């Protein structure tokens, strides 16, 4: 129940990234195990987006629990997904490294482990 203009920008920021993920995954499907679960995580993150877009509507209809723990884990979930796309594109076909990426607690470590796998592969 705060920053409704910044929440419009915050929601729109995730939407641009999901679209970016979807293009790179739709290209990949005729270009690596996470692929079925990536499409599930995209659909699950969209539920959070709908929830935000409904929250905006609810506040507009009402006279107006500020949860950032869902937002943060969403951004890190977007990173775990984007990283898995950079790895599939890199030719990593190994369910060990995918789990390592998905097992990470922070988007900061998601990219650091990504770049590490990426250089080690070359």
């Amino acid at each position: 129940h705060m920053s409704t203009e910044q929440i419009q920008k915050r929601t729109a920021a995730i939407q641009k990234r999901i679209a970016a993920i979807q293009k790179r995954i739709y290209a990949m499907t005729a270009s690596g195990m996470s692929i079925e679960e990536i499409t599930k995580q995209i659909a699950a993150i969209q539920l959070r987006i709908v929830g935000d877009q409904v929250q905006i509507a609810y506040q507009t209809a009402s006279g107006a629990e500020e949860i950032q723990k869902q937002t943060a884990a969403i951004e890190t979930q977007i990173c775990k997904i984007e990283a898995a796309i950079e790895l599939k594109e890199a030719g990593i076909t190994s369910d060990f490294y995918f789990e390592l990426i998905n097992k990470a607690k922070t988007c900061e470590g998601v990219e650091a482990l990504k770049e590490h796998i990426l250089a080690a592969h070359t």
């Binding site: 990593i92 076909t93 190994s94 369910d95 060990f96 490294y97 390592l100 990426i101 097992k103 990470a104 607690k105 922070t106 900061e108 470590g109 998601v110 650091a112 482990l113 770049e115 590490h116 796998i117 990426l118 250089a119 080690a120 592969h121």
Partner: protein, 555 residues
């Protein structure tokens, strides 16, 4: 622009201290008055860069900008040593050269500190950065802030504490250039993993990656980038402390310069309960060779991550020998017909590697817990002198008492924490000996050990035997006959004089018995009570009587 970027991030006071430290770390010759004007002009120029990012030539690198002011005064070759030759070149060759040139009253100081708070504080760092070019720059800022907070035992504690961090950073900067970035990152994975066993591999790899950028910058004289970055990794750990460790809660309450120092010293986190065996995913798995082939360094780093998080009792170097041996077998095994059957017994090869230092710690701590710091330091001085008799008598005494001091502050702790304490201290003294021997070489075997991989630097020294190429030089010219000058002072502080008598007696009679040498050292300690209880008159009578006993061995 890059100078204005660093001036804004770092504090106004912290920026000044950093540029003064970086100037004294390189042109250590120019005194305080010369360097302070250059530091002031750089801050005054950066002040303008803050306002107009394009104007005033704010666009140049910290090495061209802060490397042209360091060269403006460094014009003549005589108003500096051979380091002024570096000045003739242009970046990046200019800073590449500056790196290659590595080479006192309780109410008296306060009379100068009261008048100028800035003149006293800046003076602490000027000569401390000129006397230690490889000291960690952000740590030196905290060291001076600590100094700004009775004044005799506190400064002695900060002298000894600062001596440990300086030495620690010399080792860090040494492994980076001498053994590579991958070698530092490999140590990073191991020591961080022991420290933060709760953190997932990605968070550890993040700390490894960010910490390498910090220490690489600090060693490369990028002292302003180093402190800025050391603060950012410190913020990140504190912001995500559940994802890293438990211990970090209090460290993160502390202010900026302290917050970083605390996290670095933080206690090992209580490793997660009931972790599976690394054997399952590193020996049993069907895809061990496929995963290793995929990203070889990441797979090995993962091996180290798991082994280290589970072994906080091991040394970092032991974890590296276990990682190295696993890598070595994985390399050979993946090529074989049945790689699985090839490496199936790999962990059984780690047994002698982990036994060797545990057995050494237990054998040496058995002697320490029965001889004390004097009769154990004396025993180590006989063995280490017989091993390498090419070392200078007082340098061998210093490293013998220093290596013995390890057993003192290591055997107290139990078998579970003896090894990481022992390796930590032993590494620090061995690097202080190797730095001292690199400058004045005396032994080809010491050269071999120091030149060998940082991992087997200590194993090399422990393998040494009595140098069979040494001809007993039996002088007896004042070395075997001590001076009665220390008799008048009389103290356990001058134990180095009594010790240097032993190391000369070992070098002049090398094939001496373990009991024979203890009888010549017990008769020498008894002869001291003549010169402790006719002052110089006791030295002539004891010199003739002690030399008569030495005739029964005649080495």
């Amino acid at each position: 622009s890059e100078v204005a970027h660093r001036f804004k991030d770092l504090g106004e006071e912290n920026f000044k201290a950093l540029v003064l430290i970086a100037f004294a770390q390189y042109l250590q010759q120019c005194p305080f008055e010369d360097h302070v004007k250059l530091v002031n002009e750089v801050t005054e120029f950066a002040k303008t860069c803050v306002a107009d990012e394009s104007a005033e030539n704010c666009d140049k690198s910290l090495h061209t900008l802060f490397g042209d002011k360091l060269c403006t005064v460094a014009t003549l070759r005589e108003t500096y040593g051979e380091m002024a030759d570096c000045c003739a070149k242009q970046e990046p060759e200019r800073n590449e050269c500056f790196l290659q040139h590595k080479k006192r009253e309780v109410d008296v100081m306060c009379t100068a500190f009261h008048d100028n708070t800035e003149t006293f504080l800046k003076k602490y760092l000027y000569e401390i950065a000129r006397r230690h070019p490889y000291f960690y720059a952000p740590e030196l800022l905290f060291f001076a802030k600590r100094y700004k907070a009775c004044l005799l035992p506190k400064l002695d504690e900060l002298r000894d504490e600062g001596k440990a961090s300086s030495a620690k950073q010399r080792l860090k900067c040494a492994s980076l250039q001498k053994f590579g970035e991958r070698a530092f990152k490999a140590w990073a994975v191991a020591r961080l993993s022991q420290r933060f066993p709760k953190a997932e591999f990605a968070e550890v790899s993040k700390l490894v990656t960010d910490l390498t950028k910090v220490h690489t910058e600090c060693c490369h004289g990028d002292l302003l980038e180093c402190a800025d970055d050391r603060a950012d990794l410190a913020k990140y750990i504190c912001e995500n402390q559940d994802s890293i460790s438990s211990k970090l809660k209090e460290c993160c309450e502390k202010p900026l310069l302290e917050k970083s120092h605390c996290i670095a010293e933080v206690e090992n986190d209580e490793m997660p309960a009931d972790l599976p065996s690394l054997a399952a995913d590193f020996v049993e798995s069907k895809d061990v060779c496929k995963n290793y082939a995929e990203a070889k360094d990441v797979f090995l780093g993962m091996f180290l991550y798991e082994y280290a998080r589970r072994h906080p009792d091991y040394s970092v170097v032991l974890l590296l020998r276990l990682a190295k041996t696993y890598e070595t077998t994985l390399e050979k095994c993946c090529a074989a017909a049945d790689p699985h059957e090839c490496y199936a017994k790999v962990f059984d090869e780690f047994k002698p590697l982990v036994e060797e230092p545990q057995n050494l710690i237990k054998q040496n701590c058995e002697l320490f817990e029965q001889l004390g710091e004097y009769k154990f330091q004396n025993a180590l001085l006989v063995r280490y002198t017989k091993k390498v008799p090419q070392v200078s008598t007082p340098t061998l005494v210093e490293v013998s008492r220093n290596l013995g001091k390890v057993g003192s502050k290591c055997c107290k702790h139990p078998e579970a924490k003896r090894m990481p304490c022992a390796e930590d201290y032993l590494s620090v003294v061995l690097n202080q000996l190797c730095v001292l021997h690199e400058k004045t070489p005396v032994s080809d075997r010491v050269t071999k050990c120091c030149t060998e991989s940082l991992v087997n630097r200590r194993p090399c020294f422990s393998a040494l035997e009595v140098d069979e190429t040494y001809v007993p030089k039996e002088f007896n010219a004042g070395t075997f006959t001590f001076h009665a000058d220390i008799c008048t002072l009389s103290e356990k502080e001058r134990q180095i004089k009594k010790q240097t008598a032993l190391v000369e007696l070992v070098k002049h009679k090398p094939k001496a018995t373990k009991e024979q040498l203890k009888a010549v050292m017990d008769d020498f300690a008894a002869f001291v009570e003549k010169c402790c209880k006719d002052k110089e008159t006791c030295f002539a009578e004891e010199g003739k009587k002690l030399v008569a006993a030495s005739q029964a061995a005649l080495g």
